[PDB]
UniProtKB/Swiss-Prot annotation:
Domain (Protein kinase): residue spans on this chain: 21-303
CDD domains: STKc_p38alpha (cd07877)
Impact reported for T175E: Loss of kinase activity
This protein's domain notes: The TXY motif contains the threonine and tyrosine residues whose phosphorylation activates the MAP kinases.
Name of the protein described by the UniProt record: Mitogen-activated protein kinase 14
Active-site residues, as the UniProt record annotates them: D165
Amino acid sequence: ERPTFYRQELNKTIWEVPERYQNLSPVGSGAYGSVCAAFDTKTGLRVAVKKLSRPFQSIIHAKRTYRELRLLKHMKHENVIGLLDVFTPARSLEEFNDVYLVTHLMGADLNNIVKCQKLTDDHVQFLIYQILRGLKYIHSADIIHRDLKPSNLAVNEDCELKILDFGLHTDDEMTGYVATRWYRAPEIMLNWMHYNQTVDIWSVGCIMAELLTGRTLFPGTDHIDQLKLILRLVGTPGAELLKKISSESARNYIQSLTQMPKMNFANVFIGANPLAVDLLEKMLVLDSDKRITAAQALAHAYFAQYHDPDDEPVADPYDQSFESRDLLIDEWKSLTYDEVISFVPPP
Ligand SMILES: CC(C)Nc1ncc2cc(Oc3ccc(F)cc3F)c(=O)n(C)c2n1
């Protein structure tokens, strides 16, 4: 049955939430809405509550609202953000206007942990293992994160990690000396080709390197500067990769660059575990077809003490046929409404 709702103004906005949620307090921006910390009296969990801002103001917005709800409803994995609750104060589709999403409140993101400093190899092992464990799961559902970065990786006191914001940035915020671009695979940064799951492994490589050194791997001042930093490390592309750059314009620019060989990673990451160096070399391959997969990386010797093939689950099938579907605002809205109503809380 329908719980009782109460009203409260927080982020210049009226929040109407079930009584179970108490002590609501703003904690910053999330994807497509503002996030509040709260205490869920029913579960005893500290939770993050996101109220979506104008979820159905356009077809793009309506579809994006539906997309986020579908994604969050599907994810049931220890190392991936999951949906604890979703609600609306609306009593019918007719009065349906607002969507609230509830998940675990996380302690800190990976940026707060790196803090300009080197992490110990054992800490890097555990953190990267969990990212890859979550990624294996996400990828098995044919979902791509597309924007993996330290700020999207949340970690508790026991170093247990969850991946946030998968499967969902304007040109302006990708411009210049910005972390929004530092972790992006070159093929996606410069739109070389139709990208796939392998873009996420690139991001993991960049993250792992940063955990090991305490420094951004490719802190480019712009797209071109970043590409130069990338190619200096991994080498300029060969004829084989060049053929796969379907963009004639991008392909033509690449060939204008003086050729460079791949650097020696042992000389770049001085003092690092040779097994860490080996893994980095397999993740940071320019040709995406040849990058190590999440499933393969889990079996790499670097994770010997954590790897357990019987405790690295895959996802149920995820139907994303809706992505190629053209619908009106109210149609996306009705689909979203059905998803809200049908929600079953996790045990
Ligand atoms: C201190 C910080 C690192 N902990 C933390 N914890 C949770 C979230 C959730 C976010 O997003 C949500 C996703 C799904 C939901 F159901 C609800 C949400 F609020 C979000 O964007 N951030 C930044 C978060 N941060």
